[PDB]
Amino acid sequence: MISLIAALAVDRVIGMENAMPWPPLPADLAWFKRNTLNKPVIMGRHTWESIGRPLPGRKNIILSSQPGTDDRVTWVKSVDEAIAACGDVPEIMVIGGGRVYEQFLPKAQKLYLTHIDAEVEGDTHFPDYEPDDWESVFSEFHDADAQNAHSYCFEILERR
């Protein structure tokens, strides 16, 4: 089973200049770690270059059309291969970026979304999807506080 996890600002903005255009929200980073630990993660090369190091406790799988440049991770040249390299596991986590999210969306059964109340400019967006394909089953909104500079809402959607 394939899931996508992402944090989205207003208008589905997810990135700018290959970074994330808001301040780190530690509540959202904890949520990300909580929901990806001990699972395989699949990410595009540009996202790999943004994170800058293997996420620990996870099987890191990078998509690129070009041979790999780091043997701490697992490189693959196509979507099918990326799924194949995860093995027989309960849940594969796709961690972006925009182009990778768009390819995995039709295969996904679960979206893990953080809705952040920030109004920033971006160059990368989360893919358009069809609201009638999905069912919202968890929703948790929190206000901003001393550690988290925007209000945010965790949501999980399951494919109907």
Ligand X SMILES: Nc1nc(=O)c2nc(CNc3ccc(C(=O)N[C@@H](CCC(=O)O)C(=O)O)cc3)cnc2[nH]1
Tell me which residue has its CB nearest to ligand X. Answer: 29
- Which listed residue (3, 47, 60, 148) binds ligand X by CB under 6 A? 47
Q: How far is CA 63 from CA 28, 35, 85, in A?
A: 24, 21, 11
Q: Rounded to the nearest whole angstrom, what is the least distance from the CB of residue 51 to ligand NAP in the complex?
A: 8
From the list ligand X, ligand NAP, none, which binds 60 (C-beta under 5 to 8 Å, kind-based)? none
Q: How far is the C-alpha of 88 from the C-alpha of 1, rounded, in Å?
A: 10
Residue 97 is labelled as binding a ligand:
yes
From the list ligand NAP, ligand X, none, which binds 29 (C-beta under 5 to 8 Å, kind-based)? ligand X
DSSP string, 5-50: EEEE-GGGEEEBTTB-SS---HHHHHHHHHHHTTSEEEEEHHHHHH
**Parallel/antiparallel/unpaired status of strands 2-8 and 92-94:** parallel
Examine residue 84 and tell whether it contacts ligand NAP (CB under 6 A).
no
Residue 44 is labelled as binding a ligand:
no
Residues that bind ligand NAP (CB under 6 A): 6-7, 14-15, 18-20, 43-47, 50, 63-66, 77-79, 95-100, 103, 124
